[PDB]
Amino acid sequence: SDLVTKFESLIYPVSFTKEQSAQAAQWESVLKSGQIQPHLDQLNLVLRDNTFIVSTLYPTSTDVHVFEVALPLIKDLVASSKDVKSTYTTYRHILRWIDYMQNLLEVSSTDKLEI
């Protein structure tokens, strides 16, 4: 009970690399500084070639944390978009991952995005 909360407060899969670790820290830093928007293009390029943000076989808390910020942001960019198709084309790989993550996390009708 005490043990468990302590356990789950411990350290990331054991095959996690130094690079995966640094990239998780880096995204957490962009989240903390509120710079996800100027990092969207990069997020999109990462997801082009990687199923999940830090190249895992399952989503990590890094996926979840970035998603919380990126979902309403992308929803907003579509809303404000001068041409929606151009917007969809510009963030294809984020949209793919948004579709995955919002289903995984059983997201609300009304906060969910189209697709």
- How do the domains of the chain map onto residue ranges? 1-115
Per the CB < 8 A criterion, the answer to whether 84 and 78 are in contact is: yes
The experimental resolution of this structure, in angstroms, equals 1.9
Q: How was this structure determined?
A: X-ray
Closest CA relative to residue 28, chosen from 20, 58, 81: 20
Integer Cα distance of 40 and 35 in angstroms: 9
Residues 6 or more apart whose Cβ sits within 8 Å of residue 12? 20, 21, 24, 60
User: Can you name the CATH fold of 1-115?
Assistant: Glutathione S-transferase Yfyf (Class Pi); Chain A, domain 2 (1.20.1050)
Burial class (CB in 10 A: 0-12, 13-18, 19+), 27: buried
Find all residues with CB under 8 Å of 90, minimum gap 6, and list them. Answer: 44
**21 to 56, 60, 73: CA distances (angstroms):** 11, 11, 25
DSSP 38: G
